[PDB]
Symmetry: D2
Subunit: 317 residues, 4 copies
């Protein structure tokens, strides 16, 4: 018969609460806000529940500390993390958050092993790989939100330069969600017009493109330094919801995200940011961009960065 | 000539940021997030800006500490407040927030005097009255968000009892935004059916109605007790957005809010929670509910409660 | 796993095409446009398909003359009808459309017996009863769209008098979808305010209320006389989509529609317009309005009107 | 001061009615449906008005035969045309529709000369040029809907090949709205990946690309051959709405439409399909695609084809 869609949000902090808010507002699914901290998810769920009638949504949103409540979830979005913002690298959270995901993996494997898992917890790419390993869930049913956020920033900065609608900018960021991420300028277009043409027309310079690439890479610090007590959470929540939409509505949407890449980009099995097709069977395919030799090299360096952090985790305390 | 609609959010804390988020997502308007605290409004605006392309919105969202930036605002929403949740009474914030709203009133008077002003800062009804005095804005262009939140909770709790969609519940809360708020059970209907019929049908007891009424009055504590930093903010943000919508889209919408009532409900000039008609000229009308003798009495007590706290403010030692 | 929602529209004429258009635009489901007339559904589906990318929807919409294509449909909406608008009574289509529904019943019973069936074909109430009888589908899984259209008109005319947002008018029409339909003025409210109060305030007269009741009853002719070559189709399509939403999203929405009423309104088993709760198990409940003796009588006359047309069909050629 | 946005739809046939429907549903604006035929625009407006409460929209929709009613319109959309589908060429309607647009131009010049005008009437590119001449409106406030429809079909057919979401396909059709329209395969990307890469990857053949290009050019016939009354109307309506949105919400959106190109693409003053930037000042910019030699040649032929039919109109015998 018909059953309501169900999204479980593991971690009801800044990002987690926003996901429930937006999911409830859109009436995409029922939401289960999970957290180990007492009160937090219950208070947020009640608050969000009062807003549902205002939004004309019948989504049910509840708070809990019981993994039994995530039973039958179609999608699980993992935001759970140790406290304290990274000082200057997402990898500072590696050891703690790895242990958290061990716990989350057991809850998911027990109560909703057929769920599509979207990881957000940093260090993103290594956390996704660690989760798939420990949970044993199929590779196509486990991925990480990152590329949608990085590319959205990349697109937005390009859009803000030209003064155009950012939806009409096509632009991807690939590789690991770190300093090594690769905003692929070579495949950027604005309504079909490539950046090379705008350079010739004198409407953008290569230095401005380089500033935009740098800005994209360091964007997390710009937001964090202004917020003071945490990291970005409005956009990361929105990005996760877009990914959830792609799965639940079987969109076959092109989603840059951390997925298990084995026969593309010259890698033989690793979680990293790539353009994917997402539908009812999770990550259904990976697209291969035309990268320049410089971009292929930068990707290689990003791959090394992911492997480095991955090897550190293997030799953790 | 077409100009983008512009909404100023004065105070970029919990509620402020959510307003900017939702307004941006809906592409209702451009947003200026104002706050005295450094970084905070700039951080949230940047984060929210990155989500705009994800939502398919071209809304601009910026942060600032300069009232000149709210120039030409169509709507101004005031969340500015001193920190810390009230222990068990919204009046505790009286003098601090009154001083805050003085500077806000000066900012609005100078830079966007023709704007529609929606006050949220507690103690709500008194703050609205105070802002209008100091600012000198027309009574119909100044009002308070409260009734939509309180009525939404009332509707939600009624809907939860019958197991029906809350959107199909008509229910109003009137009077001041405090313990003396009056959920008008006499005017409640569920798809056309009044509570009296549900009693006779044995689908609800007067006891259950009394529990719902009480639950509405103290709903703020239930949320605040669980959050453990501050008070409700997801639903208050949404309520303010609905009010902004009614103005910007000239809905002629029935909106329970704190408005200047000078004839109806046996009062000659006071700001209190009443069902209004909001459109392009602000609060365009006030509707007279058919209140019972009991409800008239409870409303009278709320009027006194509001006049008390107002009188305390007028006597600045 | 996740499967896309699927709505089958049986009859791809004026109403049928609009349903697919709106369902596709909202991305509520995939749509199968069925018609026996060659070309029509194929042409409409291709046209609507080109619009999907404009709406940002991934809904698939196809045209067909093969009942196999409606296999696994969650909802079936029946608009199929003999040609030529009713001269002055919906019952003129009774004999022809009854035979059409015999055919439709066989397709549904074979290819999607677990579907929620929403009938639109006139004469609505008798056609719904005839379909349930011939198809053998459970009473709660078969209903007729009518009350949403009639009540929407009723609400709109009231709203247009007062100059208010029609969403803030609560008003029901019950009984059969014919001249005998009963707009229940006694349970009408505008933001909680009953009509009796507006009469006292001099803002509406009982004659104006009577004009509105009459206008509601004869609304179909007003539209038809202006369109010339057919009957209303924009609003009837929208109404069917709202009903489909209620089922697919398990809203528990209050939906006036033609449902099998057996223990309410003093009837012991008949399809007629009543306020229902609609969710994932179809018509899940019926609400009992407080009718005046005059309204109870008018309902009785509507019931007799339905029985009369029903008995004519039993003694058809 | 807030005023409701206002859209005039001149011609209330197939496309006109759909525009009013969708505009109303989205609450983008109020609508005035204009037509010379009696009843038709009034019938559709009344029907559509009944759907407004169902959609939760307060948009007004009215019918009229009086140009005074389009006074103060922000946008004017012209679907007015002689009846009957073209047999196999849009130019067949040339002289009839040219005379129709004379009276429309007079109506707009008198009652809403500051409006943004979106022409739909075929033969599109010539009609746009003709309307601008007779009306005397600024070149940037007058344009034609075509590219959005043609590009949407192009995107749709590309997306259907790869089995991906069409929203993630960037693709442009330029030149005149006719057989000589140029689907620019060189500027096509799917999530950043160009067609050249898909060839090398063996995911598409040049033959399949040629079929898609051809399919785009003759797409109108495929629909028209199946409808058996008139031509496509669901997607053209939606395309016009997207253009209206871009203007009313100042999107700075990339919109392929028939615009006055006086420098780019080696032309000095002609209306043809080009990718524009649309915002509050109408057609604010034109983008230069990086066309191949072949595409430059095909575009040149389209320019000649457009100049031919334009020249035939200028010589009124
Ligand atoms: N991938 C990205 O692009 C991206 C972007 C921004 C932030 N992030 C990351 O997302 C994570 C969440 O960020 P945030 O701002 O929401 O953090 P937060 O501190 O606001 O929330 C974290 C929540 O997790 C909860 N938690 C802790 N241990 C838990 C456990 N064992 N099980 C369940 N819940 C637990 C905490 O109680 C807290 O409520 C962080 O690790 C951050 O670095 C990722
Ligand atoms: N009306 C209602 O129904 C309702 C519901 C919930 C909360 N509230 C009230 O709304 C207010 C805001 O709640 P919150 O959770 O957003 O509080 P918050 O502390 O999160 O945000 C308040 C913001 O105001 C800013 N501020 C302080 N002084 C200022 C000044 N002079 N000018 C501009 N900004 C200034 C602070 O920097 C802070 O960011 C509170 O007073 C709360 O009691 C009302
Ligand atoms: N319940 C209501 O409130 C309400 C409101 C308006 C109209 N209606 C009714 O809805 C029905 C449809 O109206 P319309 O304007 O869409 O009619 P229409 O003539 O535009 O469309 C009817 C379609 O049904 C098709 N058809 C005929 N026989 C069929 C069969 N055996 N199987 C499948 N399809 C078949 C026709 O080819 C045609 O395309 C009419 O009977 C009308 O009276 C009901
Ligand atoms: N640009 C495109 O891509 C595109 C796509 C499809 C169709 N079209 C064209 O758009 C036009 C409209 O298509 P349609 O299906 O809506 O046609 P239609 O015949 O359904 O509607 C045309 C309407 O114009 C009205 N009309 C006639 N003379 C008039 C006058 N002097 N003033 C005002 N109104 C008048 C008629 O009464 C009729 O209702 C056609 O010319 C068609 O070729 C263009």
């Amino acid at each position: 018969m018909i059953e309501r869609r169900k999204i479980a949000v593991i971690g009801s902090g800044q990002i987690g609460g926003n996901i429930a808010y937006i999911v409830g507002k859109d009436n995409l699914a029922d939401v289960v806000l999970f957290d180990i901290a007492e009160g937090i998810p219950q208070g947020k769920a009640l608050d969000i529940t009062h807003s549902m009638v205002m939004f004309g949504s019948t989504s049910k949103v509840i708070g809990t500390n019981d993994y039994a409540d995530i039973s039958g979830s179609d999608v699980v979005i993992i935001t759970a993390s140790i406290p304290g913002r990274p000082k200057d690298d997402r990898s500072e959270l590696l050891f703690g958050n790895a242990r958290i995901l061990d716990s989350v993996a057991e809850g998911v494997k027990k109560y909703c092993p057929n769920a599509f898992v979207i990881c957000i917890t940093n260090p993103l790419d290594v956390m996704v790989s660690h989760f798939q390993k420990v949970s044993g869930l199929p590779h196509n049913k486990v991925c990480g939100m990152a590329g949608v956020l990085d590319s959205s920033r990349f697109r937005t900065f390009i859009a803000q330069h030209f003064g155009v609608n950012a939806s009409d900018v096509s632009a991807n960021v690939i590789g690991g969600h770190g300093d090594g991420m690769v905003p692929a300028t070579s495949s950027v277009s604005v309504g079909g017009v490539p950046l090379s043409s705008f350079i010739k027309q004198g409407l953008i310079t290569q230095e401005q493109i380089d500033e935009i690439v740098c800005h994209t890479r360091i964007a997390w610090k710009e937001v964090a330094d202004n917020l003071k007590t945490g990291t970005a959470y409005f956009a990361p929540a929105a990005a996760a919801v877009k990914m959830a939409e792609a799965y639940l509505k079987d969109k076959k949407a092109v989603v840059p995200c951390s997925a298990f890449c084995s026969n593309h980009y010259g890698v033989k099995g690793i979680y990293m940011g790539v353009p994917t097709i997402i539908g009812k069977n999770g990550v259904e395919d990976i697209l291969e961009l035309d990268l320049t030799p410089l971009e292929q090299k930068l990707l290689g360096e990003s791959i090394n960065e992911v492997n480095t952090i991955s090897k550190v985790l293997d030799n953790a305390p």
